[PDB]
RNA sequence: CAAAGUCUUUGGGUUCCGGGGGGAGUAUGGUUGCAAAGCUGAAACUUAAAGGAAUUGACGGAAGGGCACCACCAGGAGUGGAGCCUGCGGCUUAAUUUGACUCAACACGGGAAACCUCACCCGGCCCGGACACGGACAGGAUUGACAGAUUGAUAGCUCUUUCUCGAUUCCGUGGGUGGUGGUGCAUGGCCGUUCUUAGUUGGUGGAGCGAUUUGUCUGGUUAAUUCCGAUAACGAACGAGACUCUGGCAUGCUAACUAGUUACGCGACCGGUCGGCGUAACUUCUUAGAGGGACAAGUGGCGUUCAGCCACCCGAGAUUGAGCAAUAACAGGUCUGUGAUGCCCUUAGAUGUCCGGGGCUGCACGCGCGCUACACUGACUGGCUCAGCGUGUCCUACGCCGGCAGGCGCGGGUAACCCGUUGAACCCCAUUCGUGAUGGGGAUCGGGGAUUGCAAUUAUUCCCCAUGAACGAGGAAUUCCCAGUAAGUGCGGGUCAUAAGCUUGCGUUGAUUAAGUCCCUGCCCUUUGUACACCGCGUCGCUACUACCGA
RNA sequence: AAAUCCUUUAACGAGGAUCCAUUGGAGGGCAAGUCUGGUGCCAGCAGCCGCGGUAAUUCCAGCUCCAAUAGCGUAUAUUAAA
């Protein structure tokens, strides 16, 4: 049973919100796991990236603890990616998981030759830099497929990319590093300024702005 | 091992070893039959067999002719 | 007993190289210092933890192993075998509280005892602590013996061991008679003086540290307490044991003194208080010394990677970890 | 780092220069140099790494901090020295089983074992080898056995003797039970220690690529991540604390013939005394239930007026004593407590089991736990008197008989009833000896006597005579301890057929000294620093094989 | 050319002990066993990391499974990975 805390997710228990994109319209920030869970519901599968065991200083000297990277992906639209750690494994892996809703981002999908059907890959070739990687996707043709290391094939994949050249820089290893980048890499899809948005941007209410008699009543 | 009580003081200097690995050496001889405390490196096994190696010199036996009778054509069983 | 007789030497002096310098001494380290056979060394000090030979030390960051008591002990026999003092082991063990007396023989079945302090600050200190007390007691072991005195002769010292002659009696704490009180009393006294004028003053000249040799001959033994005559309390340390026989055979045996003796002598004795121009052969040996210690160094490294024992315990967990997912 | 920025959104011009570490900036050549040298400059071969930044703090031979009578100081009592009781080694022995070895082994294994226990040693017995299949076997497979020999044994165990026993077997193949057999370094559980010392761990938020950190802290204060309070933290969970038992106090409450008191009547003897006898008043004594009570509350000092400390009045009490006890660990103990157990050994001339006998107890010895002592504040001898925890179908009273160990007979007690008013010992009041190996102390032994039990010879214990020793307060060293506490002194349980010099509890007499410190043996905090470097093992001897130089 | 081979065709030619599929591997990289026996820092394996010193997931075997498949290993030159 849910019982929501913040103001955003009392107006997503209703019917107030409809998508998960007039969140991130407004850019606010998701506190609770319940409202990707709701909006995306059944559609969130996921793969644990990595279970690394850590052993941690402790003055009672060492006990294991493992570490847990969970790339959280709705096919077609919004990723998410996680890292905890904890004393069990299935533990460590809820906790990514949580974590990695928290983190859930949209990506723009854009066309390579010219725009007939769905979108399929990365709209212009961004990059994500995360600490001495340097992940860098390039659009590819439609039915290339991902051609990419297998970290950020997953990911892409379960950003619902279905075709993106890959390049990658530096010590791309270093699991946590690689994964982030290539995160980092498909937020930054929609940050990206085109000549697609260049039409001036007419503001709607926010969704604590519209539905204030509402929360009077919360 | 043995069967006398002049039988394990004849071969007192004589180390043993063990099938499972422990390397001792005899003790006292105890009864008036074949009977010894042995010590050893470690602690044995019920399931083990001790054992101690006896080595002599052997020379080949004098038996030369260099007669050798013709063979018959061989053939197979 | 000893039946292992050649890596096991070289192993345990390289323990006692580490115990002078630090506590606990790394197995990474061992290898090194003992070049002479690689990689098994650590097979050998599972056997020598079978034994009282070596501990085991793993705190918290601390890994690696200290000699233990009877180890240090071993050490010193398997140097005294190859000096051809000690072969066998005699039986009549008096178990005391700073040392241990062990019955020695040699090849030619001469029985001899052995002494070995027992110390007992980590236990490094305590097994440094007796190495200072056997030098000690040897050096007045010699410097006795060679000047008259009826003590035990000093054979050979290694670390903690002492071997002295055989002397085999009982000491005068648990004598009920003696057949000559008068002679064996004048013994004794003759014997402070003879220290006094030698220039030394026992301080603990008891009955305590007395052994009667078939109740005709006074032996002493144990001696790191000795003091200088140049003391200011010299006199009292001197009069302070002559009032401990003079009571004694008064108690005992119920002999009173004729003789008073109290005479200060010193020092007419020996003062014991202070116990191209280089030639192509001689290049050929300085190059050897410097070809030697380049291949020693990177000995030294090939060995410190053995860590096995951080690789055995990361296996273990992530077996557990992989089954569970 | 405002350049080390304007770098996968990579191109302002341009010079030099690096491509894992070594070998090596070495050889060789050239060239410059009077020289020392400089510039230029390899390879063969060897090695999984060389290293750079950051981060926790295992260890400091760091420095500080604080902590503890298993540390000290101020002290009291000892041990260690004698004699003995028992444990360990050591050594003889058929065997003198075994585990345990600094605190964390050594009156420990409820380990005070006559047999049993019992594993050890000697001689013998039994089968207690379930089961499936084959062999045999009913014209009996097999079982039990007087006599006599042998035999310790009325052991048919073997032999003669020839009787019973009716498939209940027996021989083998496998192969199941069983072992106080091996491994505690193959396991569980229980326990010991680190540690009786005090923390451990999330969740969410924040910081960082990340390891990580913050929470968990300047300061004061506390046994303390305790508290006040400061604050990128805020909240928790777990344990300590909060508690369980016990003790202290109640003239208040619930109650009593299986504890009573008071009183009356009766009795006895000089108004008394009686635990001598029965009714009524009731709970003060006694039992035991609830509910109180004490919380640093009151007042005053000192303390960043803060947590608290100190002092005292009221108070019974202004610390009662224990139990239970964390995160993790030791390759701590323990197959010898388990019908809890894994392998391995031994399984029928057995390492299964019973039987008889011994041993575990042996003795030159060291090491330890402990009792009795070394006397005058003492012992002997009378008289006087006072508890509590308990246990009881083996405790026991009461009559008699034997000095005494104990016997005889009758009773009570399956229990607040009987022992038992539990008439305990030091202690108290008189007599004795008097500085001495003494009447202190009783070892070591000779005789008898009585119990226990199938058996007391290796005295099981207990009594009564003799014998009557070392022992003169104990060095070096060390042990324990702060208020009904050390120490004296008995008692009761456990152990036990017979038994406590051990132990676990109980009281009774009852203190001196300190209410502190970090010196000591150690332990605990805090603060800070941190992921075995270099300079000081060789000599000769004959043979072959490798690679250089060479007449 | 003459043949052969292929193609085309009469007859015979298939029940798993056959008309039987191999080579490498099975700790990680890297797809697949904490299986069983043997061995006991030995023999050996292992490109690298490492495995073996008495429970060996890494050796030699047995069984089981995985990858490629009429191919599959190994050494070397070289290209991408760079």
Wanted: aromatic residues 10%; proline residues 5%.
């Amino acid at each position: 049973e849910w019982m929501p805390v913040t103001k955003l997710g009392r107006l997503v228990k209703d019917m107030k919100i409809k998508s998960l994109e007039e969140i991130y319209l407004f850019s606010l920030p998701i506190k609770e796991s319940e409202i990707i869970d709701f909006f995306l519901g059944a559609s969130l599968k996921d793969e644990v990236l990595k279970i690394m065991p850590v052993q941690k200083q402790t003055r009672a000297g060492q006990r294991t603890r493992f570490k847990a990277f969970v790339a959280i992906g709705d096919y077609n639209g919004h990723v998410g990616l996680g890292v905890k750690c904890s004393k069990e494994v299935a533990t460590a892996i809820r906790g990514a998981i949580i974590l990695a809703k928290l983190s859930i981002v949209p990506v723009r999908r854009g066309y390579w030759g010219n725009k007939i059907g769905k979108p399929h890959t990365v709209p212009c070739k961004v990059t994500g830099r995360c600490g001495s990687v340097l992940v860098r996707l390039i659009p590819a043709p439609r039915g290339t497929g991902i051609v990419s290391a297998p970290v950020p094939k997953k990911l892409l994949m379960m950003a619902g990319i279905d075709d993106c050249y890959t390049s990658a820089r530096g010590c791309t290893a270093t699991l946590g590093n690689f994964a982030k980048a290539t995160f980092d890499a498909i937020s930054k899809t929609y940050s990206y300024l085109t000549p697609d948005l260049w039409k001036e941007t007419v503001f709607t209410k926010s969704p604590y702005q519209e539905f204030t008699d509402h929360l009077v009543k919360t | 091992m043995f069967f006398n009580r002049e039988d394990v003081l004849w071969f007192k200097p004589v180390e043993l070893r063990t099938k499972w690995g422990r390397r001792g050496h005899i003790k006292e001889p105890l009864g008036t039959h074949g009977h010894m405390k042995c010590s050893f490196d470690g602690k044995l096994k019920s399931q083990d067999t001790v054992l101690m190696n006896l080595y002599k010199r052997v020379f080949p036996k004098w038996t030369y002719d260099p007669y050798v009778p013709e063979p018959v054509p061989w053939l197979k069983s | 007993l000893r039946y292992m007789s050649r890596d096991d030497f070289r192993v345990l002096t390289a323990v006692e190289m580490g115990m002078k310098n630090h506590e606990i001494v790394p197995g990474s380290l061992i290898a090194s210092i003992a070049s002479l056979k690689h990689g098994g060394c650590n097979k050998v000090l599972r056997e020598l933890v079978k034994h009282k030979l070596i501990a085991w030390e793993r705190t918290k960051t601390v890994q690696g192993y200290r000699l233990t008591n009877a180890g240090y002990d071993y050490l010193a026999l398997k140097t005294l075998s190859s000096r051809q003092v000690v072969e066998s082991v005699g039986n009549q063990m008096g178990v005391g509280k700073e040392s241990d007396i062990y019955i020695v023989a040699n090849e030619e079945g001469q029985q001899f005892a052995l002494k070995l302090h027992r110390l007992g600050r980590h236990n490094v200190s305590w097994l440094y602590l007796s190495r200072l007390s056997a030098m000690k007691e040897f050096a007045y072991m010699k410097a006795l013996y060679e000047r008259k005195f009826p003590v035990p002769k000093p054979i050979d010292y290694n670390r903690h061991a002492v071997v002295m002659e055989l002397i085999n009696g009982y000491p005068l704490c648990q004598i009920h008679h003696v057949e000559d009180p008068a002679s064996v009393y004048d013994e004794a006294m003759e014997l402070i003086v003879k220290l006094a004028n030698h220039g030394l003053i026992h301080g603990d000249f008891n009955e305590f540290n007395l052994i009667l040799d078939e109740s005709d001959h006074i032996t002493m033994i144990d001696f790191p307490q000795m003091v200088s005559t140049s003391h200011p309390n010299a006199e009292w340390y001197f009069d302070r044991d002559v009032k401990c026989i003079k009571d004694f055979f008064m108690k005992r045996f119920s002999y009173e003194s004729e003789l008073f003796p109290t005479f200060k002598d010193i020092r007419r004795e020996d003062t014991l208080d202070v116990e191209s121009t280089i030639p192509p052969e001689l290049v050929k040996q300085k190059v050897k010394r410097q070809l030697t210690k380049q291949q020693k160094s990177a000995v030294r490294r090939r060995l410190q990677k053995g860590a096995n024992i951080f690789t055995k315990q990361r296996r273990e967990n992530m077996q557990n970890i992989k089954s569970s997912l």
